[PDB]
Amino acid sequence: IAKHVDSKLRAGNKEATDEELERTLDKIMILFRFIHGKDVFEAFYKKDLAKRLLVGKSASVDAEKSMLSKLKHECGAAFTSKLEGMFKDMELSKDIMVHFKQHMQNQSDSGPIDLTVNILTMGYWPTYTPMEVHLTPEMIKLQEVFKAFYLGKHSGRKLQWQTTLGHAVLKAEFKEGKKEFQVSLFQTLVLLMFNEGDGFSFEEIKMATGIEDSELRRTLQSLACGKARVLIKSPKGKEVEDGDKFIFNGEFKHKLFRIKINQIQMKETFQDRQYQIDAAIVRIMKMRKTLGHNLLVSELYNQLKFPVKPGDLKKRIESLIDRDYMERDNPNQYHYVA
């Protein structure tokens, strides 16, 4: 159900709208307010927000924070939580990028390449470790410079880079016409390392770049196949083995002065525990008749060995209070009531 509102909030050129977009967003929340199972909707919206902000840019942050504020009502400040964090992270990334641009323009103004960082927080975002692929020497200088600048600005943070969720542009010089590529890091690395030399075999790509075998296979699946003109090869569909002799053809007659082969985004590949928790809740009561919520949670954590998530605690407390096993005037206290 959240896919509809994600598509409505997505950038769509002509999809751009006016205040009636805000009215439609309010209508969507009107349809949502009586829908149960909010956890699934929240998780889907978190994934959608991460996809829209982490890679690419959405239609407008305006309606984004408007929707976040609207979900804050009728739900609670602690319920939203992460999405506000992602929005603040995007704002901080923009500010830090402006500051880094000023710093680069100030001292030793050379600007070989145009860096654009999107520093995120470890906890909020759905992070994932990169392949630890070795970056080619053209972009190592900017990595070092920005690392030094970030360490100078913020003290004791450490940057955990992710070379799997970024973009770049390469000025191709095959023949006449500087076909500006738009590539992911893997394709940038492959093309740049192929620039020095010619006809590197697949094992040579593995050794020089260091990409994982599966990811390198997926990357080299592109730069060919589509339209059967990016790279001419006798096999079709998928055929890549160790020691394969592949070389880029010395001509690129793609009939448009805007090359985007970063098409990877498009061609992208309890009952027993609940019983134990309920029994623990019952046993904590029928003793301490009036108990606070945090005290009850701490008591159950003490009485149990395996960790268990607080979400299980909350859902079991709600389920067992639904059965008239307790009653709720402070809102963080429970009486026994049998």
Partner 1 sequence: MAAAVRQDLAQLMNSSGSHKDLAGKYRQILEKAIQLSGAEQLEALKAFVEAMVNENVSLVISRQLLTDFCTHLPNLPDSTAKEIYHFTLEKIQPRVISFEEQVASIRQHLASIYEKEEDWRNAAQVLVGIPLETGQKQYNVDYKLETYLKIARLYLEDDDPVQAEAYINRASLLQNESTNEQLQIHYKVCYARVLDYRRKFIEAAQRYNELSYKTIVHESERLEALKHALHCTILASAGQQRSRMLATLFKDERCQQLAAYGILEKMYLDRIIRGNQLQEFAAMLMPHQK
Partner 2 sequence: KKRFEVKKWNAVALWAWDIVVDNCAICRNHIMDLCIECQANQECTVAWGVCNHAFHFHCISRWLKTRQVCPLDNREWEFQKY
Partner 3 sequence: NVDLENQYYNSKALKEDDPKAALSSFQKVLELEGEKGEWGFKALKQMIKINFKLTNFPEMMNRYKQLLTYIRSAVTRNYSEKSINSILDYISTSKQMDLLQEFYETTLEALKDAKNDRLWFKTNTKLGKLYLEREEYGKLQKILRQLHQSCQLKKGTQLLEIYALEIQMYTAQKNNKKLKALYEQSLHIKSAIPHPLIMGVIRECGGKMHLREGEFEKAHTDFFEAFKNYDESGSPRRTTCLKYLVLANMLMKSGINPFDSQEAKPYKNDPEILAMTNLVSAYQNNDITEFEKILKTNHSNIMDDPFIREHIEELLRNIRTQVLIKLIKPYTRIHIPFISKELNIDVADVESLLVQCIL
Q: Point out which residues bind partner 2 (CB under 8 A).
A: 54-55, 78, 112-123, 125, 127, 138-139, 142, 150, 154, 156-163, 165-174, 180-181, 185, 188, 191-192, 194-195, 292, 294-295, 297-298, 301-302, 307-310
CB nearer partner 3, residue 21 or residue 300:
21
Q: How far is the CB of 226 from partner 2 (least distance, A)?
A: 20
Residue 197 binds to partner 1 (criterion: CB under 8 A): yes
**Residue 208 touches which member of partner 3, partner 2, partner 1, none, C-beta under 5-8 Å by kind:** partner 1
- And the tokens for 252? 């690129």
CB distance 48 to 2 below 8 Å: yes
Q: Which two tokens stand for residue 12?
A: 């769509």
86 in contact with partner 3 (CB under 8 A): no
Q: Which is nearer to partner 2, 25 or 231 (CB)?
A: 231
Contact 121, 85 (CB under 8 A): yes
59 binds partner 3 (CB under 8 A): yes
Burial tier of 309 (Cβ tally within 10 Å: 0-12, 13-18, 19+): exposed
Q: Does 203 bind partner 1 (CB under 8 A)?
A: no
According to the binding rule CB under 8 A, does residue 143 interact with partner 1? yes
Q: Which long-range contacts (CB under 8 A, 24 or more apart) does 127-131 make?
A: 127/160, 127/162, 128/162, 128/164, 129/160, 129/162, 130/161, 130/162, 130/163, 130/164, 131/163, 131/164, 131/210, 131/211, 131/212, 131/215
Instruction: Name which of partner 2, partner 1, partner 3, none residue 62 binds, using a CB cut-off of 5 to 8 Å depending on partner kind.
Output: partner 3
The Cα 267–Cα 173 span in angstroms is 26
Residue 180 found at the interface with partner 3 (CB under 8 A):
yes
Spatial CA neighbour of 81 closest among 57, 45, 53: 45
Closest CB to partner 1 among residues 113, 207 = 207
Query: What does 123 interact with, of partner 1, partner 3, partner 2, none (CB < 5 to 8 A by kind)?
Result: partner 2
Shortest CB 99 distance to partner 3, Å: 6
Q: Is 127 left (phi over 0), alpha (psi -120 to 50) or beta?
A: beta
How many chain residues bind partner 3 (CB under 8 A)?
37
Q: After which residues is the chain broken (C to N over 2.5 A)?
A: 269, 328
Stretch that binds partner 3, among 90-98, 159-167, 284-292, 319-327 (CB under 8 A): 90-98
Given a contact cutoff of 8 angstroms between Cβ atoms, the answer to whether 187 and 262 are in contact is yes
Q: Which residues bind partner 1 (CB under 8 A)?
A: 130, 132, 134-137, 140, 143-144, 158, 161, 196-198, 207-208
